[PDB]
């Protein structure tokens, strides 16, 4: 039964779906817990914009870095070898970039981050209520109502309209981004099915072979290290550990401990 | 809810409920009494005794010592129903609520009307009494219930003495010590249960011996196959032989030795 | 529910409930007492002793030791029911409700009516009394319950003293050291187990030997075959032989070695 | 059930202390009488008074044993007296009528003197005026104090007696205590084997008598070995039974101790 | 169960302080006794005087053994007394009447001077007017502090006492702790197999006595080999038994250490 | 099942995650237990500073002590030998410093600590009624208001502005530290990949050799240590 | 738990509320370990300060953890400074609103401030001392591990041989007393398997008891006081 779970774990679509669901849940928890939408007139666009970008950037970097094989790819970087490196890089990038795309999409769909983000950028010259011959209190109240300040002075309905407008735009952006992303994927796949010299079945076989041989060589290296250490003990103490020791014992002296300290 | 159907329902009406009190207590008593006679094997070999002689030569001296046992082993069932009803008190109070003397009520002054005393007293078991007489009803209801509960306890006492009286006479007048009667008691049941068990088997073997002649073979279960392989039969038991083991047996000694069942008397060839 | 059937319901009435209470507790004691005599085998052989002689040869004094045993053993049933009812107290209070003197009543001033005394007191157990006399009703209820429990605790005390006197004197005046009596009391209760056990086996074996001569074979279970195979019967034991192992027996010794049961006496011829 | 033996206090003057005496003394007495009978050490003592019919033996040897009889049977009344005193219901119902109205405290001089005993009688049953409830509560604790007071100190005097008796027992018994421990383990070992053999030697004699009557004795599979392994020819003489019943005080035979009359009989 | 064993303060002057002593000291007192009885070291120490009756052993050699005996049984008094002090029920009930009213603070002078002690006595029973709840609370909290202060330092006294004695016992004793561990294990092990041998040798003698009376002994399967494995002829004389019990302090015989009087008797 | 649990323990990804969850949960109760945000006018910046870094620092002290490897490194220290040790030191450092920043980040994103830490250093020039020419009450009220003194005296607007601006500063201070931690981890592994002469494939052999070098030798020591003891007892008592 | 509020007396409780329960825990630790008596034996019979701290600190965990956890609740320290007529009311605060508010926060502020000092001290002590002792000790950790395992296997086998060697002793004496031994089923072969040759002398065991720190002879490593006894 657990073998089936591991088999589905090998399915990349399932692991990417798990990543997307986990990122969406984390974003929802973060928004519901620790956002608070600071309401300062001076720099409020900064807070929302940072909330939009920094989590996406750190998730992208984490996805790129958590894959060990990309380090080897870069080391080789720093014919067919170039094509294979490009294919592996694209395949790893896909999973590296799925999560930040999910974060951006869900944030835009929710709309709160964009709502608090570009709120002071709203156009109010159309509305005749906001005269503000001072020209400064207008920006103050504009940044002030979207966060938590109702300020029930007839402006609330206006503010909702403004909010609605921004929210509407947010949704579009999300979907717009989504559209572009999908388009990119398609053309990206085109490259992976146009510049690739290997057959479609050849690529999957080759990847399975690479994973098999990597695991096999790791196991072989561990076993070789184990055998080398076993040999070191059977040459120092004169007996093989884990076997019948009642035959001989070296009884090493003080000078013998220094020899095994070399590695 | 079968017990719910036979539940007592007192019809509150003068000169009427005590009939219902009788026919809702006596009849189940009569039914229980009849069942005791029918199922008691000691009553059939009594009937078959007078049947086959067709003359009734035998006197009443041997009949009465058995006839009491026939009722005694069966009359217990009506009594344990008659006493239970009396202890509950429902049967008596509805039966006799009409007869309560209108001058014998206490715990209240002279508030009992005399227009229809029997009628109003008849409805006491149904609790359909005006609240101005609720003291009277709770006096008559508790008084009548006493009379029943007194009679029920007394009746248990009378059986509690008749049993001890009988069990003494049945051991003082019989010519056999009790330790021998226990054997004779442990033999009548030991034989009868063997007889019934062996009758069924010799029935089945005879049956399987005829069906085979009608089909060429007989279907038998795995354990039933052992029965045919062990207890073969040659025919049937003649009627006069079946007629000598039915009836009443009274300790006929043979050549200085005892016989404990009428079958045993035939077993020695007598 | 048989508990509701035999429940003690007090008929609150003058000169009536004590008659009921007498027959609502004594009669079950009588039934319990009758059961004890009937089941105890020590009374049938005492009866069987009176039937074979037909003359009253045996003296009463030797038989009084056994005569006290049947009554003594069966006396638990009345005592364990007379005492339990007394401690519960319901039986007594309904019985003696109507005898309480109104003048000697306490806990309240002399406002107890005397127009119809016994009628009101008789109604105390059923709680059918005006609340103006609730203090009186409770006072008599507690006082009467006190006498029941005091009588009940006295009753159990007397029985315990009687048992102590009985067992102490029985061991003192018996002519056998009490260790031997234990062996003897471990014999009669052991013989009767074997004697009953073979009574059936020598009955069933005699049952089979009768049916077989009639039907031509006998149906048996797997175990019953061992009974017929291992234990064969030849005939029946004579009636006088049965007569020699029923009755009372009082430590008749032979030659200097005891015989513990009358059957053992007959086993020596 | 516990309801039947539950303590119900009759709140009456000069009456409840009678009930408390009966509701505590009698259960104590019934336990003590039970204790004597069950303890097998008293019957042989009783049987000791029988066979001699002269009282040759002096009281001094008997006194050391006689304490072991009453004392070992006194545990049941003590553990019943203690719990009743610790529970406290009996004691307060016992002495309620003897509380001095003058010594009453926690309240002003408000307690009536019309019928003090009658009022004092109804304290345990909550049959008291609310104005006197303070008096009732005060005596509900002062009286309950004495019961719990008497219970604990009566426990202590019992407790020191166990130590006093045991230490004196080891002080006066000539043999060493570890040997006495072996003697204790011998009495249980002989009694069990004798009792276990009492049934078997009864059964063999039982089957040897029924067989002579019926012609065969019906025995189950396990009882069959009892007849085969353990055959008997008769009974034992009455004097032989009469020589292994009674009391025994460490009679030494030629430097070899004997632990039981049977052992003394086993040496002839 | 737990309802019987509980604390209820008798709110009475010159009376509750007796209850606190009785309700705790006596249960502690009996627990002190119980430890003595169960321990086997007491009786042999007690039996030491019996076999001499002359005071052959001087005070100095025998004083060493006395120290260990009391401490082993002292577990029960300390494991209970500090627990009650932690609850503080005894102290609040005992010395409430002896609290000096002059030291009462954190309130205006309101407590009556007519009966200062009587009012103080009723504090534990929750019987106190709400105006004096502050006066009740301050003392109740003060007494609970003092009780807990007393109780806590008791544990420290126990803690230091065992620590200093253990090294002192090691320092005073001429034996290494590794030697003591083996020797102490020997006593804790030789006793167990001594007792087991006692019952087997008890039963074997018991079986032989019954057989000489009945003629056969009814033993279970495991007891059958007991007769075969360990057949005895007689018993062991009282002087041989006496040479086992008593006290013993590590005698030596030609460089051979002896660990028990039995081992001392083993060499003859 | 149980073997799978130990197998996943070998991977270092779950080890970092397991410590992170414990720190946040205990902090969420400890911060609400005996923190209480005091308003010591004389010294409250000490209060915020102490329980913002010091409880994280002790984990680093614990982290170094939790590994027996770095004690050996100190002994050898007190070349290729340094190159191998430096890689091990980096790997030891990687698993040792995750926890202190883990608690540091969540406290910064919580915003409760900084509010009670640097309130007295805030700027009050914008508000026109924190004039306080005496320059005495201003420090006290600035370091007194945010704790529990709501003071609805036309200054609650400032207390929202001060808290929100600090919370924004608290939130902004959060990721920036997160960003630098990610940056350092990225280059350090890249440095460990280029500076180390051994290939990553050859790195696996050596690292696997390290993890079983402690076990096999220790197992050999135990067998030899015991076998000596019985032969001593044979000479002492003759028992195996 | 119980927090007394009496002025000029609460500070006594605070010391008793933590210090006394802490030290008894420390006493339990030293008692349970057998290394303390080894030093006691060595001093009784006859540079060892490094070994003392190693075993002393091992038992120091239990007293330490109680001290900090009590300060975590913090009610212990609120009694101390508050006590040091209005001062009594301050002690009544945990049991004039401006006066009581300022002091109460001050007490809790100092409570955790003093509470975390020990933890910082603990980390330094467990770090520096462990490092310096290993550096001071000439033997390597591999030798140290073998030294620890030599002692770890020593006690389990000594207890194992002590019990068996005790039965073969005690059985003989009881046999001399009664005439046989009622040994159990598993112990039947125990006597036959190991017939002891006698009882070893007292000074023989005395020599192997004490402190031993690698007094190597002729280049042969020696680890225990019994090891040199060979």
PDB file of N, CA, C and O in Angstrom, chain F residues 30 34 36 40 43 47 51 61 64 71-72 78 148 217 221-222 224-226 228-229 233 235-237 239-240, chain G residues 72-73 105-106 108-109 112 116 123 127 130-131 135 141-142 146 149-150 153-154 157 160-161 194 200 204 229-230:
ATOM      1  N   UNK F  30       5.138  31.326  25.716  1.00  0.00           N
ATOM      2  CA  UNK F  30       6.067  32.045  26.580  1.00  0.00           C
ATOM      3  C   UNK F  30       5.928  33.553  26.413  1.00  0.00           C
ATOM      4  O   UNK F  30       6.012  34.302  27.394  1.00  0.00           O
ATOM      5  N   UNK F  34       4.971  35.513  30.540  1.00  0.00           N
ATOM      6  CA  UNK F  34       5.687  36.381  31.470  1.00  0.00           C
ATOM      7  C   UNK F  34       6.479  37.444  30.723  1.00  0.00           C
ATOM      8  O   UNK F  34       7.532  37.895  31.182  1.00  0.00           O
ATOM      9  N   UNK F  36       4.571  40.398  29.087  1.00  0.00           N
ATOM     10  CA  UNK F  36       3.714  41.399  29.714  1.00  0.00           C
ATOM     11  C   UNK F  36       3.993  42.819  29.236  1.00  0.00           C
ATOM     12  O   UNK F  36       3.272  43.748  29.615  1.00  0.00           O
ATOM     13  N   UNK F  40       9.285  50.133  31.626  1.00  0.00           N
ATOM     14  CA  UNK F  40      10.347  50.747  32.412  1.00  0.00           C
ATOM     15  C   UNK F  40      10.891  51.976  31.696  1.00  0.00           C
ATOM     16  O   UNK F  40      11.551  51.858  30.658  1.00  0.00           O
ATOM     17  N   UNK F  43      14.876  51.967  31.756  1.00  0.00           N
ATOM     18  CA  UNK F  43      15.476  50.948  30.893  1.00  0.00           C
ATOM     19  C   UNK F  43      14.403  49.959  30.440  1.00  0.00           C
ATOM     20  O   UNK F  43      14.125  48.973  31.128  1.00  0.00           O
ATOM     21  N   UNK F  47      14.893  45.483  27.935  1.00  0.00           N
ATOM     22  CA  UNK F  47      13.917  44.399  28.007  1.00  0.00           C
ATOM     23  C   UNK F  47      13.637  43.816  26.629  1.00  0.00           C
ATOM     24  O   UNK F  47      13.617  42.593  26.452  1.00  0.00           O
ATOM     25  N   UNK F  51      15.202  39.669  25.310  1.00  0.00           N
ATOM     26  CA  UNK F  51      14.373  38.560  24.850  1.00  0.00           C
ATOM     27  C   UNK F  51      14.003  38.675  23.383  1.00  0.00           C
ATOM     28  O   UNK F  51      12.902  38.272  22.987  1.00  0.00           O
ATOM     29  N   UNK F  61      24.594  28.107  21.101  1.00  0.00           N
ATOM     30  CA  UNK F  61      25.460  27.448  22.074  1.00  0.00           C
ATOM     31  C   UNK F  61      25.081  25.980  22.205  1.00  0.00           C
ATOM     32  O   UNK F  61      25.948  25.098  22.244  1.00  0.00           O
ATOM     33  N   UNK F  64      26.189  23.985  18.840  1.00  0.00           N
ATOM     34  CA  UNK F  64      27.581  23.548  18.787  1.00  0.00           C
ATOM     35  C   UNK F  64      27.823  22.372  19.724  1.00  0.00           C
ATOM     36  O   UNK F  64      28.521  21.417  19.365  1.00  0.00           O
ATOM     37  N   UNK F  71      34.042  19.262  18.674  1.00  0.00           N
ATOM     38  CA  UNK F  71      35.029  19.104  19.736  1.00  0.00           C
ATOM     39  C   UNK F  71      36.316  18.499  19.192  1.00  0.00           C
ATOM     40  O   UNK F  71      37.418  18.926  19.557  1.00  0.00           O
ATOM     41  N   UNK F  72      36.192  17.498  18.317  1.00  0.00           N
ATOM     42  CA  UNK F  72      37.369  16.924  17.674  1.00  0.00           C
ATOM     43  C   UNK F  72      38.070  17.953  16.799  1.00  0.00           C
ATOM     44  O   UNK F  72      39.303  17.979  16.724  1.00  0.00           O
ATOM     45  N   UNK F  78      43.875  22.793  17.976  1.00  0.00           N
ATOM     46  CA  UNK F  78      44.698  23.142  19.128  1.00  0.00           C
ATOM     47  C   UNK F  78      45.333  21.897  19.742  1.00  0.00           C
ATOM     48  O   UNK F  78      46.007  21.129  19.055  1.00  0.00           O
ATOM     49  N   UNK F 148       0.135  49.305  28.622  1.00  0.00           N
ATOM     50  CA  UNK F 148      -1.260  49.129  28.995  1.00  0.00           C
ATOM     51  C   UNK F 148      -1.980  50.448  29.230  1.00  0.00           C
ATOM     52  O   UNK F 148      -3.187  50.432  29.494  1.00  0.00           O
ATOM     53  N   UNK F 217      33.911   1.818  14.810  1.00  0.00           N
ATOM     54  CA  UNK F 217      34.970   1.871  15.812  1.00  0.00           C
ATOM     55  C   UNK F 217      34.404   1.739  17.219  1.00  0.00           C
ATOM     56  O   UNK F 217      34.968   1.029  18.060  1.00  0.00           O
ATOM     57  N   UNK F 221      35.139  -1.117  20.022  1.00  0.00           N
ATOM     58  CA  UNK F 221      35.598  -0.797  21.368  1.00  0.00           C
ATOM     59  C   UNK F 221      34.769  -1.521  22.422  1.00  0.00           C
ATOM     60  O   UNK F 221      35.317  -2.052  23.395  1.00  0.00           O
ATOM     61  N   UNK F 222      33.448  -1.557  22.242  1.00  0.00           N
ATOM     62  CA  UNK F 222      32.582  -2.192  23.231  1.00  0.00           C
ATOM     63  C   UNK F 222      32.874  -3.682  23.347  1.00  0.00           C
ATOM     64  O   UNK F 222      32.947  -4.228  24.454  1.00  0.00           O
ATOM     65  N   UNK F 224      35.692  -5.292  22.611  1.00  0.00           N
ATOM     66  CA  UNK F 224      36.985  -5.500  23.252  1.00  0.00           C
ATOM     67  C   UNK F 224      36.936  -5.133  24.728  1.00  0.00           C
ATOM     68  O   UNK F 224      37.552  -5.807  25.561  1.00  0.00           O
ATOM     69  N   UNK F 225      36.210  -4.066  25.070  1.00  0.00           N
ATOM     70  CA  UNK F 225      36.125  -3.646  26.464  1.00  0.00           C
ATOM     71  C   UNK F 225      35.477  -4.721  27.324  1.00  0.00           C
ATOM     72  O   UNK F 225      35.923  -4.985  28.445  1.00  0.00           O
ATOM     73  N   UNK F 226      34.422  -5.354  26.813  1.00  0.00           N
ATOM     74  CA  UNK F 226      33.727  -6.362  27.603  1.00  0.00           C
ATOM     75  C   UNK F 226      34.559  -7.631  27.736  1.00  0.00           C
ATOM     76  O   UNK F 226      34.683  -8.182  28.837  1.00  0.00           O
ATOM     77  N   UNK F 228      37.600  -8.225  27.878  1.00  0.00           N
ATOM     78  CA  UNK F 228      38.611  -8.125  28.920  1.00  0.00           C
ATOM     79  C   UNK F 228      38.027  -8.373  30.303  1.00  0.00           C
ATOM     80  O   UNK F 228      38.669  -9.037  31.124  1.00  0.00           O
ATOM     81  N   UNK F 229      36.822  -7.865  30.570  1.00  0.00           N
ATOM     82  CA  UNK F 229      36.247  -7.928  31.910  1.00  0.00           C
ATOM     83  C   UNK F 229      36.014  -9.359  32.377  1.00  0.00           C
ATOM     84  O   UNK F 229      36.371  -9.704  33.508  1.00  0.00           O
ATOM     85  N   UNK F 233      37.384 -11.571  35.613  1.00  0.00           N
ATOM     86  CA  UNK F 233      36.572 -12.293  36.585  1.00  0.00           C
ATOM     87  C   UNK F 233      36.997 -13.752  36.671  1.00  0.00           C
ATOM     88  O   UNK F 233      36.984 -14.345  37.756  1.00  0.00           O
ATOM     89  N   UNK F 235      40.020 -14.892  36.417  1.00  0.00           N
ATOM     90  CA  UNK F 235      41.125 -14.847  37.363  1.00  0.00           C
ATOM     91  C   UNK F 235      40.640 -14.521  38.771  1.00  0.00           C
ATOM     92  O   UNK F 235      41.187 -15.041  39.750  1.00  0.00           O
ATOM     93  N   UNK F 236      39.611 -13.682  38.892  1.00  0.00           N
ATOM     94  CA  UNK F 236      39.113 -13.297  40.207  1.00  0.00           C
ATOM     95  C   UNK F 236      38.239 -14.389  40.819  1.00  0.00           C
ATOM     96  O   UNK F 236      38.520 -14.880  41.916  1.00  0.00           O
ATOM     97  N   UNK F 237      37.169 -14.778  40.121  1.00  0.00           N
ATOM     98  CA  UNK F 237      36.219 -15.752  40.640  1.00  0.00           C
ATOM     99  C   UNK F 237      36.092 -17.016  39.805  1.00  0.00           C
ATOM    100  O   UNK F 237      35.603 -18.025  40.326  1.00  0.00           O
ATOM    101  N   UNK F 239      34.229 -17.084  36.972  1.00  0.00           N
ATOM    102  CA  UNK F 239      32.922 -17.017  36.332  1.00  0.00           C
ATOM    103  C   UNK F 239      33.031 -16.229  35.034  1.00  0.00           C
ATOM    104  O   UNK F 239      33.675 -15.175  34.994  1.00  0.00           O
ATOM    105  N   UNK F 240      32.403 -16.743  33.979  1.00  0.00           N
ATOM    106  CA  UNK F 240      32.466 -16.125  32.658  1.00  0.00           C
ATOM    107  C   UNK F 240      31.872 -14.722  32.693  1.00  0.00           C
ATOM    108  O   UNK F 240      30.756 -14.522  33.169  1.00  0.00           O
TER     109      UNK F 240
ATOM    110  N   UNK G  72      10.347  30.862  36.183  1.00  0.00           N
ATOM    111  CA  UNK G  72       9.519  31.081  35.002  1.00  0.00           C
ATOM    112  C   UNK G  72       8.103  31.483  35.389  1.00  0.00           C
ATOM    113  O   UNK G  72       7.495  32.341  34.741  1.00  0.00           O
ATOM    114  N   UNK G  73       7.556  30.871  36.442  1.00  0.00           N
ATOM    115  CA  UNK G  73       6.280  31.340  36.969  1.00  0.00           C
ATOM    116  C   UNK G  73       6.405  32.766  37.489  1.00  0.00           C
ATOM    117  O   UNK G  73       5.494  33.583  37.310  1.00  0.00           O
ATOM    118  N   UNK G 105       4.558  46.024  37.834  1.00  0.00           N
ATOM    119  CA  UNK G 105       5.269  45.803  36.580  1.00  0.00           C
ATOM    120  C   UNK G 105       6.772  45.773  36.809  1.00  0.00           C
ATOM    121  O   UNK G 105       7.491  44.991  36.177  1.00  0.00           O
ATOM    122  N   UNK G 106       7.264  46.622  37.715  1.00  0.00           N
ATOM    123  CA  UNK G 106       8.687  46.642  38.029  1.00  0.00           C
ATOM    124  C   UNK G 106       9.151  45.292  38.556  1.00  0.00           C
ATOM    125  O   UNK G 106      10.265  44.847  38.256  1.00  0.00           O
ATOM    126  N   UNK G 108       7.756  42.176  38.010  1.00  0.00           N
ATOM    127  CA  UNK G 108       7.765  41.185  36.939  1.00  0.00           C
ATOM    128  C   UNK G 108       8.862  41.483  35.926  1.00  0.00           C
ATOM    129  O   UNK G 108       9.456  40.561  35.355  1.00  0.00           O
ATOM    130  N   UNK G 109       9.139  42.767  35.690  1.00  0.00           N
ATOM    131  CA  UNK G 109      10.221  43.138  34.784  1.00  0.00           C
ATOM    132  C   UNK G 109      11.564  42.646  35.303  1.00  0.00           C
ATOM    133  O   UNK G 109      12.381  42.121  34.537  1.00  0.00           O
ATOM    134  N   UNK G 112      11.869  38.238  35.344  1.00  0.00           N
ATOM    135  CA  UNK G 112      12.447  37.566  34.187  1.00  0.00           C
ATOM    136  C   UNK G 112      13.858  38.060  33.910  1.00  0.00           C
ATOM    137  O   UNK G 112      14.688  37.303  33.393  1.00  0.00           O
ATOM    138  N   UNK G 116      16.623  34.927  33.608  1.00  0.00           N
ATOM    139  CA  UNK G 116      17.383  34.456  32.459  1.00  0.00           C
ATOM    140  C   UNK G 116      18.890  34.532  32.660  1.00  0.00           C
ATOM    141  O   UNK G 116      19.634  34.043  31.803  1.00  0.00           O
ATOM    142  N   UNK G 123      24.698  27.902  29.997  1.00  0.00           N
ATOM    143  CA  UNK G 123      25.241  27.596  28.678  1.00  0.00           C
ATOM    144  C   UNK G 123      26.755  27.755  28.652  1.00  0.00           C
ATOM    145  O   UNK G 123      27.464  26.929  28.063  1.00  0.00           O
ATOM    146  N   UNK G 127      29.549  24.610  28.302  1.00  0.00           N
ATOM    147  CA  UNK G 127      30.359  24.704  27.093  1.00  0.00           C
ATOM    148  C   UNK G 127      31.848  24.792  27.410  1.00  0.00           C
ATOM    149  O   UNK G 127      32.630  23.944  26.970  1.00  0.00           O
ATOM    150  N   UNK G 130      33.389  21.711  29.597  1.00  0.00           N
ATOM    151  CA  UNK G 130      33.525  20.462  28.856  1.00  0.00           C
ATOM    152  C   UNK G 130      34.691  20.532  27.879  1.00  0.00           C
ATOM    153  O   UNK G 130      35.448  19.565  27.733  1.00  0.00           O
ATOM    154  N   UNK G 131      34.861  21.673  27.210  1.00  0.00           N
ATOM    155  CA  UNK G 131      35.946  21.813  26.247  1.00  0.00           C
ATOM    156  C   UNK G 131      37.305  21.790  26.936  1.00  0.00           C
ATOM    157  O   UNK G 131      38.223  21.089  26.493  1.00  0.00           O
ATOM    158  N   UNK G 135      40.530  19.130  26.595  1.00  0.00           N
ATOM    159  CA  UNK G 135      41.834  19.646  26.193  1.00  0.00           C
ATOM    160  C   UNK G 135      42.873  19.417  27.283  1.00  0.00           C
ATOM    161  O   UNK G 135      44.023  19.068  26.993  1.00  0.00           O
ATOM    162  N   UNK G 141      39.359  11.419  22.949  1.00  0.00           N
ATOM    163  CA  UNK G 141      37.968  11.066  23.205  1.00  0.00           C
ATOM    164  C   UNK G 141      37.707   9.599  22.881  1.00  0.00           C
ATOM    165  O   UNK G 141      36.884   8.951  23.538  1.00  0.00           O
ATOM    166  N   UNK G 142      38.394   9.060  21.871  1.00  0.00           N
ATOM    167  CA  UNK G 142      38.294   7.630  21.599  1.00  0.00           C
ATOM    168  C   UNK G 142      38.784   6.819  22.789  1.00  0.00           C
ATOM    169  O   UNK G 142      38.146   5.842  23.193  1.00  0.00           O
ATOM    170  N   UNK G 146      36.416   4.581  25.325  1.00  0.00           N
ATOM    171  CA  UNK G 146      36.780   3.250  25.797  1.00  0.00           C
ATOM    172  C   UNK G 146      36.912   3.217  27.312  1.00  0.00           C
ATOM    173  O   UNK G 146      36.522   2.230  27.946  1.00  0.00           O
ATOM    174  N   UNK G 149      33.361   3.102  28.619  1.00  0.00           N
ATOM    175  CA  UNK G 149      32.749   1.798  28.392  1.00  0.00           C
ATOM    176  C   UNK G 149      33.399   0.717  29.244  1.00  0.00           C
ATOM    177  O   UNK G 149      32.738  -0.263  29.606  1.00  0.00           O
ATOM    178  N   UNK G 150      34.686   0.868  29.561  1.00  0.00           N
ATOM    179  CA  UNK G 150      35.331  -0.066  30.477  1.00  0.00           C
ATOM    180  C   UNK G 150      34.662  -0.030  31.842  1.00  0.00           C
ATOM    181  O   UNK G 150      34.414  -1.076  32.451  1.00  0.00           O
ATOM    182  N   UNK G 153      30.844  -1.352  31.492  1.00  0.00           N
ATOM    183  CA  UNK G 153      30.739  -2.805  31.505  1.00  0.00           C
ATOM    184  C   UNK G 153      31.231  -3.406  32.814  1.00  0.00           C
ATOM    185  O   UNK G 153      30.916  -4.563  33.107  1.00  0.00           O
ATOM    186  N   UNK G 154      31.993  -2.648  33.602  1.00  0.00           N
ATOM    187  CA  UNK G 154      32.534  -3.188  34.844  1.00  0.00           C
ATOM    188  C   UNK G 154      31.433  -3.428  35.869  1.00  0.00           C
ATOM    189  O   UNK G 154      31.360  -4.502  36.477  1.00  0.00           O
ATOM    190  N   UNK G 157      28.793  -6.351  35.106  1.00  0.00           N
ATOM    191  CA  UNK G 157      29.325  -7.693  35.296  1.00  0.00           C
ATOM    192  C   UNK G 157      29.668  -7.970  36.750  1.00  0.00           C
ATOM    193  O   UNK G 157      29.517  -9.108  37.206  1.00  0.00           O
ATOM    194  N   UNK G 160      26.502  -8.840  38.218  1.00  0.00           N
ATOM    195  CA  UNK G 160      26.117 -10.159  37.729  1.00  0.00           C
ATOM    196  C   UNK G 160      26.889 -11.264  38.440  1.00  0.00           C
ATOM    197  O   UNK G 160      26.304 -12.275  38.841  1.00  0.00           O
ATOM    198  N   UNK G 161      28.200 -11.090  38.614  1.00  0.00           N
ATOM    199  CA  UNK G 161      28.975 -12.111  39.307  1.00  0.00           C
ATOM    200  C   UNK G 161      28.750 -12.075  40.811  1.00  0.00           C
ATOM    201  O   UNK G 161      28.900 -13.106  41.475  1.00  0.00           O
ATOM    202  N   UNK G 194      29.196 -23.274  38.530  1.00  0.00           N
ATOM    203  CA  UNK G 194      30.240 -22.450  39.138  1.00  0.00           C
ATOM    204  C   UNK G 194      30.469 -22.879  40.580  1.00  0.00           C
ATOM    205  O   UNK G 194      29.990 -22.228  41.519  1.00  0.00           O
ATOM    206  N   UNK G 200      36.978 -14.871  49.154  1.00  0.00           N
ATOM    207  CA  UNK G 200      38.181 -14.086  48.925  1.00  0.00           C
ATOM    208  C   UNK G 200      38.453 -13.165  50.114  1.00  0.00           C
ATOM    209  O   UNK G 200      37.515 -12.728  50.789  1.00  0.00           O
ATOM    210  N   UNK G 204      41.826  -8.002  49.801  1.00  0.00           N
ATOM    211  CA  UNK G 204      41.869  -8.231  48.361  1.00  0.00           C
ATOM    212  C   UNK G 204      40.850  -7.363  47.636  1.00  0.00           C
ATOM    213  O   UNK G 204      41.160  -6.761  46.601  1.00  0.00           O
ATOM    214  N   UNK G 229      44.895  -4.398  39.518  1.00  0.00           N
ATOM    215  CA  UNK G 229      44.977  -5.505  40.460  1.00  0.00           C
ATOM    216  C   UNK G 229      45.328  -6.827  39.790  1.00  0.00           C
ATOM    217  O   UNK G 229      45.724  -7.768  40.487  1.00  0.00           O
ATOM    218  N   UNK G 230      45.195  -6.923  38.471  1.00  0.00           N
ATOM    219  CA  UNK G 230      45.534  -8.144  37.754  1.00  0.00           C
ATOM    220  C   UNK G 230      47.039  -8.392  37.784  1.00  0.00           C
ATOM    221  O   UNK G 230      47.546  -9.092  38.660  1.00  0.00           O
TER     222      UNK G 230
END
